[PDB]
Design a binder for this molecule. Structure first.
Ligand SMILES: C=C(C)[C@]12C[C@@H](C)[C@@]34O[C@](Cc5ccccc5)(O[C@@H]1[C@@H]3C=C(COC(=O)Cc1ccc(O)c(OC)c1)C[C@]1(O)C(=O)C(C)=C[C@@H]41)O2
Ligand SMILES: C=C(C)[C@]12C[C@@H](C)[C@@]34O[C@](Cc5ccccc5)(O[C@@H]1[C@@H]3C=C(COC(=O)Cc1ccc(O)c(OC)c1)C[C@]1(O)C(=O)C(C)=C[C@@H]41)O2
Lengths: 480, 480, 480, 480
C-alpha cells in the first residue's frame, strides 16, 4: 500500500486524468489548491505527473494535456510564484526529473510548449520571427541546459547510469540536437582534433622510446652525453608524463561521477581502459627505478593498450565510430558467452588427450596449445607417433575438430550476424551520445579559461513577462 | 465413417457453436441435461469442450463462452457435485486435458475466470484486494498446479513428449510464470547453484585422479602408504561413486518418465548424455578390475564427456542458456544432413584419388585423412610425387577443394545463419521450459525431507460457497 | 497485328468481361452461337478463356465467372456434345492449356467445380458423401490425370520446360497434392527405396572392383582361376552393366522429352549427370580393350561422379532433399558468376608475379598454383628468396591476399547468405516437383507389367447425367 | 533575411498552391502575368515550380496540377510563344532542371503529359495510335533526348555528380527505359562486345609480350632478325599503343566532364583506374628508354591492373554486373573502416612484441609480417625460442589472435552481410545507370561518322498545331 494521495489529492487526480477535482480545488472557500507546497518526500505535483508517464501515445496525450492545464492553472491562480523552478529532495526540476527518468514525451512538451494568450506568454518555449511557406525561423529561449549551476540537462542525460530506458533516444529532439551540432561545429571540433593529433604524437614518441630501450639488464641505465641518450630519456620523460596525466584524469572522472560498480564495466568503458593503461605505465616506472628487469614486461602492456585506445578517437567520425562501437559491444556482451563454451570444449578434449597418451606433448599446457591450434587452421592430426590406443586418440581429435572448428566457430559467425542485424540502428544513437559526452567534457575543461560558447544571445526575445520587467534567456534560433 | 454425435449432441452443438440446444436440454421435462454422468469412453462433456479448441480467436471465444455457460448451468442444476473434478479414463481433468493437448486459450480461461454473482462465486479464479491507478493487487486461488496428486499442471506440461503444439508456450501465462519465477527466487536457485558447484568439484577431482594414473601396465595397481596413493585412490573412489550415482539417477528418470524411443533422442537429451557418461565410467571400472590395460580408453571418453556435460548447467543463466540450447539444436537436427553430404563428397573423391595412384598414401584411410585436411586449412596439393596421370590427379583435387572447402562449408555457414535467424525467439521459451523441468525435479527430490514450499496460504479468502462451508485453496498474490 | 475480333467476337467479349454479347449470340434466330466449332488456328473459345488469364484476383474472378457462365450456356444449347474434350491444333484441352501455361487460378477452379442443379451437374468436380461439422468427406471424379492417353495433366506440368511461371506452385492444390501423396505412400515409396539400395550396392561393387585393379600395365589382364580374379572380373562386368544401363536410360529420357538445349542444363540436371557418368564408364571400357594404360584415367571420373550422384536420391527425404537442391542451385547459377571474378584476379596477379621474378616457381603454372593456395590457407608470403624488386613483389602479394582472401571470399559468403534467405521457400516446392517427377517415371516404367495403381474406383457416384447413362470416372475420396 | 517575394508573387502562389492569385494575375487589365520574362537570376516561373518539388505524393499532385494549369493558361493567353523552351542562366529547360535536380515526379509528368482539347493538343507528350483492350500503342514525340544541342536529358541524368537524390531512379520511367533498351538492342550491343573482344586481345598480347621480356639487364635490347624478336617488339608496340590510347581517352573524359575532385573518387571510378593503368604503362616506357632496369617494376603494375580492369566490361552482363558493382562498393566504402581498425591492432601488438623480445625477428617489419600471417591461417605461436618473459609474450600473442582472427574478421563478415542486404536493390539501378553511361559514350564516339540511330521517325502524328503547319519531332512508339 501507499501513494501520494495523502494530504495531496491533486497528484492522484492528475494520475487519474480526473481534472474536475483539479479545477475544483482552485479557490474553494473550504480549502484552496495549494499546488506550490512541496510534499513530505520533497517533490511537487509537477514531479508526480512526470512519474506517471510511459511514452506511449495515449499516456503521452493524457499526461501532456494534464500537465499543460495544471501549469496554466498554477500561473493564473498564483502569478507571484513559479512552479517549474521548485526542486525535489535531490534537486531535480520537472525538466530534470523527466530527463533523468527518460520521459521522452514530457521532455518533448517541456522544450516545445507555446502560449497564445496574454499575460502568460512567459510559459512558451518556441517563438517565431520569420514565416515563409517552405521554411520558418523559430526560436527557443531555453535556460538550464548549458549551465544550470545545479545540474544541466545534458549533464543529467549524458551521465545517467544506463538505467534510463531512453538513455540515448531523447537527444534526437531538435532543441538539443541542434545545440549539440552547433557546439560541435563552432569550437569543439577543433579542440577534439587537436587532442587527437596530440595523442597520436604521444604514442609515436612512446613507441620510439620503448623500442630503443637499452638492451643491457639491471636498470636504471647511465646516460651518455651523446644525442641518442638525450632523445631516449626525453622520450621516456614524455611517456611517463602522459601516463601520470591519464592517471589523474581517470581518477578525477571516477570521483566526479562515481558510478555504481556494476555500471562501471558496462559504461565508462573508455575511461577504465585509459586508466588501466596509466596503471601499467606507473607500475612500469616503479619497477624501472626498483632495479628490476621486469619493467619491460609491464611497459609493453601499456604500449599494447596505448595503440588500441586510439579507437577511442573514432568517435568524431560517424562513418567509422559506428564501426568502432561494435568491438566494445561484442567484447562486453558476446565474448564471455562464447569463451566459456570454447574453454569447456578445449579443456575437456585437452585433458582427455593428455591423460590418454603417456610414456614433449606430455604436459597439459602443450596439448592445450596444440588443440587451440585447430582454431587458427594449423592443426596437424598427427602430433604424436607410436602411442597406445591410436584409434581412440584419432576419434577424440576428429570429434574435437568437428565440434569446434566446423560448428562452434560457424555458430559464432551466425550469432554475430544476428546481433549485428539487431543493432543496426542502435549504434548510431550510441555514437551521438558518445559525441554528446565528448562535447560536455570539452566544454567543462576548456583548457584556457575561455567560456564564450553561449547560444544565439540574451536579447529581449519574449517581452511578455508577468511583471513589467524584461526577459533575458540566451535565446537560440532554428530555421524550420 | 462415424462421428461423436452418438448419445451426446452437445459435442455437435459445440462443434457448430449452437448454444440453444444447451439451454433446451438444460431442464426439459421430457429429459433434462445429465451433465454429471460420464461418457462411455470415460470422459465428460467438459473434456469434449477442451478437445474442440484450436487456440484461434473465434474458436477461443466460442469454446470459452460455451464452457462458461455449461459450468454455470451445472452449478445451478446440480449444486451438490463438482464437474471439473471428474476424471476421464486416463485420469485427466479438463484442466489437465487442456494442458496435455496444448490448448492455450482454454488454459488461459480456466486459471483466469471470474464471477460477479452470488451462490456461485466459488468458481472465480482471480480476486482483487487493492486497486490503485497504475497498479492493482490481484489474487489467484490456484490449486491442482503444484501437487494435484493425480496430474499436476506442471507435470503435464513439462513432461509432454514434444508432440504438444504449444509445448513451451503454455508456461508464459501469468499464473504459471509468476509461480515458477518465485519458486526459482525463493529456494530452488540456491539448491541449483550448490549442485553446480558440487559437480564442478566432481569433475576437477576426476580429472586430477585420471591424469595421475600410474603409468605401468596391468591393473590393478598396488597401493603404497605414501600420501600420493591415498589421494589417488580416494580420487578414484569419488570418481566411480559419481559415475554410479549418475547411472542410478538416469535409470530412475527413464523408468519414471518412460518416453517413446522416438522422443528419447529429441527430448531427454541431457539425461541420455549423462547416462552415457556413467556407462563409460562403469565400463572403465569393469575393465579396470578385469586386468585389462585398455580401461584407459573407456576412462577418457567419460572424462571427455564429463567436462562437456557442464553445459547442462548453463540452463540457469538465460543469456547463456539460449546459447547452449542453440548448440544442442544444431548438433541434433542439422548435423546429420551436412555430415551425409560431406561424407559423400569426401568418400567419392578419396576413393577416386586412391584408386588412381598406385605402385604411404596408398591406403584408403590415409587418403581419406589427407582430403579431410582440406577443410581445416592444411591441404598441400602435392602430397604425391612421380605418379602417373598427374593432370588427372590435380583436376580431381582441385575439383574437390572447390567443391567442399570453397562452397560446401560456405553453404553450411549460410544455412546456420538462416536457422539462427529463425530460432532467435524460440530459444527463450525453450530455456524457460528447461528451467521449469529443473524446478520440478528439484521439488521432487528435495534432498532432506524438506517440503515447506507452498503458496501464500490456505486462509479463508473467499467464503462465498453455495454451501456454508469455507475455502482453503493455498492462495497466491500477484502485484499487477 | 492479329487480334480476336476476326470472326470470333466471343473471345473479345471474354477479353472485355461483357456477358451480354455472349448471351445475345447464344441462340439468336439471326445466327446462334456456334461455340462447338473450332477456330482456324485449331483452338476453341474455352482455350481463349484460358489465354486471357493472368492469375490476379480480379482477373481470377472475371475469368472464373465468365467461364462458368459460358460453359453452362454451351451445355444448355448443345446437350448432345461435350466442350471441354475438344482439343486444339497441338492436342491440349482447356485443362491441359491452363496447366501448360501455368494458370493457377483457372487450374484451381477447373478441378474444384460444383453445381446444385439437375441435368447439368455432370460438369461438377467435387462431390460430398459424408457431412460432419468440422470435417466433410468429399470426392473427385477427376480423370485425365494419371493416364489420359493423349497428354496427362501431371505429364504436362512435370515436363514443362521451366517457362511456366507457376512451374511448381500449381501442384500444391488438393486434387493433385493428395493424389501424389497417396501414390507415394502406397507403392512408389517401396520401389524408390529399393532402387536406392540397389544403386548403393552398385557403387560399392564398382568401388571395390576399381580399387583392386591389377597394378601391372598393358590391359587387358589375363584371368587366373583363383577366386580373386573371379570376384574382380564379376565386379567389372557388373560395373560396365550398370554403365550401359544408365546410358540407355539417359538416351531414352532425351528422346522422349527432347528439351530445348537451353533448358537442357537448367533442367534435366540429374539425367545429364548420370549420362555423363555412363559416358566416362563406356569410354573406360573402350580404352580398356584398346590396350591403353590410361583407361583408369576415365574410370575414376566415373567413380568420382558415381558417389556424388548418390545425392540424387536425397529427393525422397524432404529434410535432406531440400539441402541437396540448394547445392544444385548454387553450383549451377552462382559458380560461373564467382569463378569469372576469381580467375581474373588470380590470373592478373599470377602473371604479374611470374613476369616480375625471372633469372622453380618460374612457370606460370606453379605460380598460378602458389597464389591459388592463399585461398585454402597455405600461402607463405616468402616462396622466393634473393630476387630483384622485392618491395614490389611483396606489395603485389599483399594486394592479392587482401583482395581475394580477405574481401572476395567473405563477400562470397555474404552473397550466399542473401541468396539462401531468398530461396528459403522456393526449394520446398522444387522438392515436391522433384518427387512428382520421380513418381511419374516410377509409374511409367513399373518394371513388371503391374499397373494396379488406379484411384478409389469407378463407382456410379453421381449418376445425374443429362442422358440416362451412368458415370464411371475412377473417383477419389478426400476427407476434408 | 531574404526571400523571392520581390516582383514575382507567382512563384509564391505556386509554392502555396493558391490558384486564385495566378488566375487573377493572368490577364488583368491593370497588369497581366508576364510569365515569359526571366527573373533576375535568369530563370522563369516554370523553373520555380520545379524548384519547390519534393517527390512526395501530395507535393507531386500539387505541383503537377498547378504546372498543367499554368501551361494551359500560357497556351490560351500567349499562343505566339512557347514557355517550356525558355532557358535559365545556365541553359536548363524545366525538364532539364527537373532532371538535374532529381525531380522524379515532375520529370515523370512532363514527359508524359496529355491533352484532350483542340487548339492546344500540340503541347502533349503522349499520343495514342492503336487502342486494343489489353494493349495499346502510344507514341512520344520527345525532343532534347538524343541530341538537344545544348544538353540532352540523358546527359543531365548520366553525368550528375552523384549528389542528386534520385541519381538512377529517373531512368526507370518508360520513355527513357524503353529507349535505352532499344538502343542497346539495336546497334550498341555489337559495338560494346566488339570493344570487349578487342580489349581481351590487347591484354593477351600485353601479357605475352611482357612475360617474354629479355632477361639480360640494361635496356633497350638490340633486336635480332629472328622471328621471336619481331613478335616481341610488335607486342611491345601494341602494348604501348594501347597505353597511350587510354591516356588520351581518359584525359578527354576528364576535360569534358570535369568532376569536383571529391566525386572524382566517388564516381568516374572506372576512368581513373584505366587512366592509372596508362600512367604506369607510360612511366614504364619512359624508364625503358632511360636505360634503367626498374621499368619492369612499373610494367607489371599495369599488367596487374590491366587484367583486373576487365571487370569494367562486366557491365553489359546484368547477372554479373550486379556482382562487380558490389565489389566496387565494398572497396570504396568498407575497406577504409576495416583497414584502420586492423592496422591499429596489427601495429599495436607488433610493436609490443618487437620491443619485448630483443637480444631475425628483431625488425618491426618481420614481426609485422608474422602477426599479419595469423589472418591467413599460417601463424605458429612459437616463432621465437629461449627469450625472456615468455609468459608475457604468449599472453600478448593469444590476445592478438583472439582479437583479430577470431573476432574482427568474423565481425567483418557479418558487417558485409548487413551492407550487402541493404544494397540488394540499389545495385540493379546502379547497373542500369552504368549501362546508360556506356550507351551515351558509345553514341558520342560512334567510331566511323555513323549517326543513323534516331527514334521511330518524323511522322505527322499530332497535326494539332495552332498554326496550320505539321509536327516533325522524331516520334517513338511504345506498345503498352
Ligand atoms: C547424442 C549423442 C549420443 C552424442 C554422444 C557423443 C558421441 C557426442 O557426439 C554425438 C555426435 C557427435 C559426434 C562428433 C561430433 C559432434 C557430435 O553428440 C553427442 C555427444 C555430444 C557432445 C557435445 O555435446 C553438447 O552439445 C553439450 C551439451 C549441450 C547442451 C546440453 O543440454 C547438454 O546436455 C548435457 C550437453 C560431446 C561428446 O559427448 C563427446 O565428448 C564425444 C567424444 C563425442 C560427443 O553423439
Ligand atoms: C554440370 C556438369 C556437367 C558438371 C560435371 C562435372 C564436371 C562436375 O563439375 C561441374 C562443374 C564444377 C567443376 C568443379 C567444381 C564444381 C563444379 O558440375 C557438374 C559436376 C558436379 C559435381 C557435383 O554435383 C552435385 O552437385 C551432386 C548432385 C546434386 C544434386 C543433384 O540433383 C544431382 O543430380 C544427380 C547431383 C561433381 C562432379 O561430377 C565431379 O565429381 C567432378 C570430377 C566434377 C563435377 O560440371
Amino acid at each position: 500500500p501507499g501513494f501520494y494521495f495523502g494530504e495531496l489529492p491533486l497528484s492522484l487526480a492528475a494520475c487519474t486524468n480526473q481534472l474536475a477535482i483539479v479545477k475544483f480545488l482552485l479557490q474553494n472557500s473550504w480549502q484552496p489548491a495549494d499546488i506550490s507546497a512541496r510534499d513530505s518526500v520533497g517533490n511537487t505535483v509537477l514531479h508526480a505527473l512526470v512519474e506517471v508517464a510511459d511514452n506511449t501515445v495515449d499516456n503521452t496525450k493524457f499526461v501532456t494535456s494534464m500537465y499543460n492545464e495544471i501549469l496554466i492553472l498554477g500561473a493564473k491562480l498564483h502569478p507571484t510564484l513559479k512552479l517549474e523552478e521548485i526542486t525535489n529532495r535531490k534537486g531535480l526540476t520537472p525538466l530534470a526529473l523527466a530527463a533523468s527518468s527518460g520521459k521522452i514525451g514530457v521532455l518533448a512538451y517541456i522544450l516545445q510548449r507555446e502560449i497564445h494568450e496574454p499575460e502568460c506568454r512567459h510559459l512558451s518555449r518556441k517563438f517565431t520571427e520569420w514565416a515563409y511557406g517552405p521554411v520558418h525561423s523559430s526560436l527557443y529561449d531555453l535556460s538550464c541546459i548549458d549551465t544550470c549551476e545545479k545540474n544541466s540537462v545534458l549533464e543529467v542525460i549524458a551521465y545517467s547510469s544506463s538505467e534510463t530506458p531512453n538513455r540515448h533516444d531523447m537527444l534526437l529532439v531538435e532543441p538539443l540536437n541542434r545545440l549539440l551540432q552547433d557546439k560541435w561545429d563552432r569550437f569543439v571540433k577543433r579542440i577534439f582534433y587537436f587532442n587527437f593529433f596530440v595523442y597520436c604524437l604521444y604514442m609515436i614518441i612512446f613507441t620510439a622510446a620503448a623500442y630503443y630501450r637499452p638492451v643491457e639488464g639491471l636498470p636504471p641505465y647511465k646516460l651518455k652525453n651523446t644525442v641518442g641518450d638525450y632523445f631516449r630519456v626525453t622520450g621516456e620523460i614524455l611517456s611517463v608524463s602522459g601516463g601520470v596525466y591519464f592517471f589523474f584524469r581517470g581518477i578525477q572522472y571516477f570521483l566526479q561521477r562515481r558510478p555504481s560498480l556494476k555500471s562501471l564495466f558496462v559504461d565508462s568503458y573508455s575511461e577504465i581502459l585509459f586508466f588501466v593503461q596509466s596503471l601499467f605505465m606507473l607500475v612500469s616506472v616503479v619497477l624501472y627505478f626498483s632495479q628490476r628487469k621486469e619493467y619491460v614486461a609491464s611497459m609493453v602492456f601499456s604500449l599494447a593498450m596505448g595503440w588500441t585506445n586510439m579507437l577511442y578517437y573514432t568517435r568524431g567520425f560517424q562513418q567509422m565510430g559506428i564501426y568502432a562501437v561494435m568491438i566494445e559491444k561484442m567484447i562486453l556482451r558476446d565474448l564471455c558467452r562464447f569463451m566459456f563454451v570454447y574453454l569447456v570444449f578445449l579443456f575437456g578434449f585437452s585433458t582427455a588427450v593428455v591423460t590418454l597418451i603417456e610414456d614433449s606433448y606430455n604436459s597439459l599446457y602443450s596439448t592445450c596449445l596444440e588443440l587451440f591450434k585447430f582454431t587458427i587452421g594449423m592443426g596437424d592430426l598427427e602430433f604424436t607417433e607410436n602411442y597406445d590406443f591410436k584409434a581412440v586418440f584419432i576419434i577424440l581429435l576428429l570429434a574435437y575438430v568437428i565440434l569446434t572448428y566446423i560448428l562452434l566457430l560457424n555458430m559464432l559467425i551466425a550469432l554475430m550476424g544476428e546481433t549485428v542485424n539487431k543493432i543496426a540502428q542502435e549504434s548510431k544513437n550510441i555514437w551521438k551520445l558518445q559525441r554528446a559526452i565528448t562535447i560536455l567534457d570539452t566544454e567543462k575543461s576548456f583548457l584556457k579559461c575561455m567560456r564564450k560558447a553561449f547560444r544565439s544571445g540574451k536579447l529581449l526575445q519574449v517581452g511578455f513577462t508577468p511583471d513589467g520587467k524584461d526577459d533575458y534567456r540566451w535565446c537560440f534560433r532554428v530555421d524550420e
